[PDB]
Amino acid sequence: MVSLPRMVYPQPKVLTPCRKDVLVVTPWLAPIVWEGTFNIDILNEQFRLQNTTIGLTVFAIKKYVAFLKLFLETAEKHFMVGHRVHYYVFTDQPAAVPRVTLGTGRQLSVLEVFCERRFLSEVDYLVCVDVDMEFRDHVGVEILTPLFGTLHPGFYGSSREAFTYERRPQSQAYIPKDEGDFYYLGGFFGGSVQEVQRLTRACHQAMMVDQANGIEAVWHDESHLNKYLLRHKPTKVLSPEYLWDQQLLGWPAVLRKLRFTAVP
Ligand SMILES: CCCCCCO[C@@H]1O[C@H](CO)[C@H](O)[C@H](N)[C@H]1O[C@@H]1O[C@@H](C)[C@@H](O)[C@@H](O)[C@@H]1O
Ligand SMILES: O=c1ccn([C@@H]2O[C@H](COP(=O)(O)OP(=O)(O)O)[C@@H](O)[C@H]2O)c(=O)[nH]1
Ligand SMILES: [Hg+2]
Ligand SMILES: [Hg+2]
Ligand SMILES: [Hg+2]
Ligand SMILES: [Hg+2]
Ligand SMILES: [Hg+2]
Ligand SMILES: [Mn+2]
């Protein structure tokens, strides 16, 4: 909307690829976010001029409340630093949520298990992630777009036939062996509030239909997420840098950074 100010940075090289080891754009022209593909200074300017507010949602039920401290502490160090952030912690143990110190312009709401309409009036984007994780490096506005999915660290190099999609035609999450772009994680997705609510509403209805027909998708919510993103292409896809497990997968050369990881 508003003009960017004068900025001094390296000129992009038309005849020099960003990365020659990985795919950086999908066949529907959605960028695949890898380190080296974006200039964060330009993106930060663009989103700050919009006074962007990002909502980060996590569920912490039962024993999972134990992961909140590290999750929030590291998010304060690496998640959208500099931008407005609103944390939404859904838990069955409100009094168990740790008292974490937040930077200015960032807030946290504890919701005991809220109106879906509230999201529309409080944030511009919603980022939904698993709580038994920790941020280890930058996770910023480069991920913001109408709808995004993240490449599962265990299948990013696999062929579609190897993807663990739901293969039973009786399930609404059914995806045949000759279909599929990528295998997306259920633990890290997001986009505009409108698109995220459309995705979760679609998933909710599809799972209800499956339940009625007495069937449960092989990987539950994640199976439906994959069906949704197959039929509604994400406008950005995040590389495995955004959700990794160093204990189980190490640190491959293809990953210049490990940004969000599983907690042992
Ligand atoms: C992080 C590397 C994990 C590779 C092992 C297979 O990971 C599982 O993949 C299926 C889909 O085929 C589901 O997505 C499971 N939820 C995955 O395992 C669980 O989540 C991954 C990220 C790991 O944290 C693993 O330890 C969990 O069991
Ligand atoms: O009793 C439970 C089970 C799961 N979760 C949430 O569901 C996410 C996914 O579950 P889990 O960690 O068990 O799955 P994994 O990533 O190991 O496949 C977790 O990160 C939690 O945020 C929760 O809050 N309470
Ligand atoms: Hg580049
Ligand atoms: Hg969400
Ligand atoms: Hg989530
Ligand atoms: Hg669902
Ligand atoms: Hg879903
Ligand atoms: Mn998890």
UniProtKB/Swiss-Prot annotation:
It is an enzyme of class 2 (transferase). This protein is the basis of the ABO blood group system. The histo-blood group ABO involves three carbohydrate antigens: A, B, and H. A, B, and AB individuals express a glycosyltransferase activity that converts the H antigen to the A antigen (by addition of UDP-GalNAc) or to the B antigen (by addition of UDP-Gal), whereas O individuals lack such activity. Its cofactor is Mn(2+). The soluble form derives from the membrane form by proteolytic processing. The gene is ABO. Binds 1 Mn(2+) ion per subunit. Pathway: Protein modification; protein glycosylation. Glycans are attached at N51. It is found in: Golgi apparatus, Golgi stack membrane; Secreted. An alpha-L-fucosyl-(1->2)-beta-D-galactosyl derivative binds at H152, T164, E222, D245. The keyword Manganese applies. Belongs to the glycosyltransferase 6 family. GO terms for molecular function: antigen binding; fucosylgalactoside 3-alpha-galactosyltransferase activity; glycoprotein-fucosylgalactoside alpha-N-acetylgalactosaminyltransferase activity; manganese ion binding; nucleotide binding. The active site is at E222 (nucleophile). UDP-N-acetyl-alpha-D-galactosamine binds at F59, A60, I61, Y64, D130, V131, D132. This is Histo-blood group ABO system transferase. The chain holds residues 64 to 345 of 354 of the full protein. Changing M133R: In allele Bel01; loss of manganese binding and reduced catalytic activity. Expressed at high levels in testis. Also expressed in pancreas, uterus and lung and salivary gland. The keyword Lipoprotein does not apply. It catalyses: an alpha-L-fucosyl-(1->2)-beta-D-galactosyl derivative + UDP-N-acetyl-alpha-D-galactosamine = an N-acetyl-alpha-D-galactosaminyl-(1->3)-[alpha-L-fucosyl-(1->2)]-beta-D-galactosyl derivative + UDP + H(+); an alpha-L-fucosyl-(1->2)-beta-D-galactosyl derivative + UDP-alpha-D-galactose = an alpha-D-galactosyl-(1->3)-[alpha-L-fucosyl-(1->2)]-beta-D-galactosyl derivative + UDP + H(+). GO terms for cellular component: extracellular region; Golgi apparatus; Golgi cisterna membrane; Golgi membrane; vesicle. Its main location: Golgi. It comes from Homo sapiens.
